[PDB]
Symmetry: C3
Subunit: 248 residues, 3 copies
C-alpha cells in the first residue's frame, strides 16, 4: 500500500525502503512502524525481490520513537498483547525476513534506530552517524531483543555500558561493538553495491545460510515478546504518567 | 569491623575498597566472606543504588593469600563470586596495579570495569595445576570469544590493560580509574531505579545457569587442589 | 604414513604439516581422512601433549581440490579437530580457503602472518555452510561479521580475520610463534589443560550435531542446479 514517509523502489531485485520524514528527522510514529513492517513482510513474498535495503532518504536514519506520539500513548496505552504494539511488530518482521536485510546509517540513529540493527545482516554507516539507546534514561527498558542480542553482538561489558548509561556514541564505538560492519565514505552507494553483489549469488544458498545462522529465531521472537511485556509495565508506570502529565 | 575493607556510602553509591597494602590486597578466607556479605547486604539496602568495588591504593588484588592458601560451592572465593553475580544493582569495578586470579574472574561478574595503564592481569590457574573459577570457562568465552579466552586460560600469562580492553574485560582505559568509576556511579544513581533493575535482570536472564557453572567449576577446582600437579 | 602429510613429534609437541605445495595444498578425499586420523591418534598418544597443524612454506590450503553426509571426508576432518582433547594450534600463511577457514573454528589458538588470504566461498558455488560455521563463526566473530563473510563469499586479509576473532595474533613468523606457544603449553600440567578445555567445550555434542546438520544440507545443495 502507498503511504507517506516511506519511499519504495525496486530495481534489479533490490528493494530500497527509505524513511522520509525530514521535518522530524525520521522519528517513527505508530502507523509508520506498521507500514515498514508490512513492506518487509510483502518483500519476503515478492519473487522479484532478492535483497532489502532499509535506510533514511537523506541525512538521518531515525530520531527514534516520536515523542509527541509517545506522550499520547502513555496517557491512552494499548491494552492488547504487548508484543503487538507497533515497534515490536516492526522488529519481529525484520527478524523474520528470510532474505538478506542491509541497513545504511547516516546521522541520528536512536532507540529503535539501534535495536533494528540487531535484526539486519549487514550494516554500513558513515562518520556522521550518532547512535543512542535512551531507554533507561526515558524510564523504559530494553526492546528488540537487545537484552540478549546486544550482549551477544557486543560482549556483556559493552552492552551494559550502552544500555545502563544510555549515552550517545559515535560510529567508531558502534563498529567496535559490532553494530556496524564498516564505516564508509558513501553509506548508501556501498549498501546498494553490496545488495547488487548479493542478488548475483544464488537465492537458495543465501536463504539456507541465513536460516541456519538464525536457527534460534523462535527464541529471539520469545525474547522480543517478553521484553515487550516489561517495556509496557514501564510505559504504564505511575511515575511515567505524572512526568508526561507535567510535561504536557 | 575489619580494617582490610573500607566501606562507604555517599549519594547512593557504596564504595568498597580492599585495604591490605602489606600483601598487595591478597585475599584470605574471612576477608572473601566479608566482601561477599557486604555485597549481599548492599543489595538489600534501599539507600544503596550502585556498588563500586576496588582497591584502596595502588593495587586491586594479588589474588589468594598463599598462606591462607596453604561442599565445594561454599569455599570462600566461590562464595564471593556468587554474591557478585547475584547483586541486582549495577556493579562497577576499578582496577589499578595487580589483578590476579579472582582479580580477573571477578571482573566477569561486574557490569562495567575501568582500568588505568598500570593494571597487570593474570589467570594463573592452569600453571598452578588448578582449573577455572568464577564461571570463566563460559563467561570468558562469551566475553572475549573462544580463541582469546583459550589464550588467556591455557597460557596463564600476565597481560596489560590494552589486552584486557580488546578481550572485553575492561570497558575503557582511563587516566584516573577511581575518579572515572565514581563519576559513572553517580551518573547511574541519577537514572530511574526500576529501569536499571529490570534491564540488568533481562541481561542476566540466565543467572541460574551462571550459578550452576560456578558451582560445577568449584567441584572440579577442589579436586585439582588435592593433586601432584598442584604440589609441584 | 601418507603422501602430502608430514608429522613430527618432539618435547610433547606433535607438528602436522600439509605438504602439497604444487597444488597450494588443495585437499582431496584421502588427504582429509589422513589428517583426521592423525588427530584421532595424537589424542590417544601419551607422548603427545599439544598439536600444531600447519601448511607448507608459503600456504595453508587452497581448500577443496576442484578435480551419509557425515562421512564425507572434509566433515570427518572438521569433527576430529573439534573432538581433540588436547590443545590444537593452527598457523596460517598465504591461502586459506573454505576448509582453510572453517577448521580455524575448531582450533584453540590461531596465528597468521600478513600474507594470509582467507575466503569462505560456499555461497558463490550455490552451496551452504560447513564446519558448524553457521553457529561457531556467529559466536566467535558476532552475527554481523559472520553474515558479511558468509553471505558475500569475499576474500579477506589477516587484519579482518584478527578483528573477526578467527586469528589470535598477527605475527612475523607464524610457524615460530606457534612452536613457542606449543612449548610453553607442553611445560604446563596436561591435566589442567585437558580439564580447562573440556569445560570450555562443555557443549561439544551440540558442536558435532551442528557440523552433521550442516553436512546433510550441504550434500543436497551439491546436487542443485545452482551447483
Amino acid at each position: 500500500s502507498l503511504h507517506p514517509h516511506l519511499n519504495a523502489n525496486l530495481e534489479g531485485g533490490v528493494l530500497t525502503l527509505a524513511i522520509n520524514r525530514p521535518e522530524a528527522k525520521n522519528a517513527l510514529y505508530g502507523e509508520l512502524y506498521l507500514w515498514i513492517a508490512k513492506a518487509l513482510d510483502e518483500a519476503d513474498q515478492n519473487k522479484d525481490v532478492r535483497v532489502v535495503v532499509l535506510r533514511g532518504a537523506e541525512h538521518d536514519f531515525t530520531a527514534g520513537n516520536d515523542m509527541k506520539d509517545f506522550m499520547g500513548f502513555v496517557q491512552n496505552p494499548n491494552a492488547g498483547p504487548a508484543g503487538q504494539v507497533p515497534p515490536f511488530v516492526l522488529l519481529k518482521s525484520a527478524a523474520r525476513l528470510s532474505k538478506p536485510l542491509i541497513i545504511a546509517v547516516k546521522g541520528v540513529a536512536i532507540g529503535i534506530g539501534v535495536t533494528i540493527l540487531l535484526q539486519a545482516d549487514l550494516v554500513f554507516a558513515d562518520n556522521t552517524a550518532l547512535f543512542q539507546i535512551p531507554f533507561v534514561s526515558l524510564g523504559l527498558s530494553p526492546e528488540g531483543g537487545a537484552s540478549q542480542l546486544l550482549v551477544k553482538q557486543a560482549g556483556y561489558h559493552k552492552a551494559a555500558e550502552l544500555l545502563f548509561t544510555a549515552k550517545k556514541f559515535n560510529a567508531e564505538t558502534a563498529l567496535q561493538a559490532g553494530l556496524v560492519n564498516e564505516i564508509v565514505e558513501d553509506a548508501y552507494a556501498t549498501a546498494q553495491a553490496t545488495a547488487q553483489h548479493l542478488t548475483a549469488l544464488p537465492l537458495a544458498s543465501l536463504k539456507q545460510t541465513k536460516a541456519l545462522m538464525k536457527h534460534d529465531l523462535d527464541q529471539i521472537i520469545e525474547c522480543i515478546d517478553h521484553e515487550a511485556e516489561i517495556f509496557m509495565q514501564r510505559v504504564q508506570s505511575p511515575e511515567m504518567l505524572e512526568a508526561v502529565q507535567a510535561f504536557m
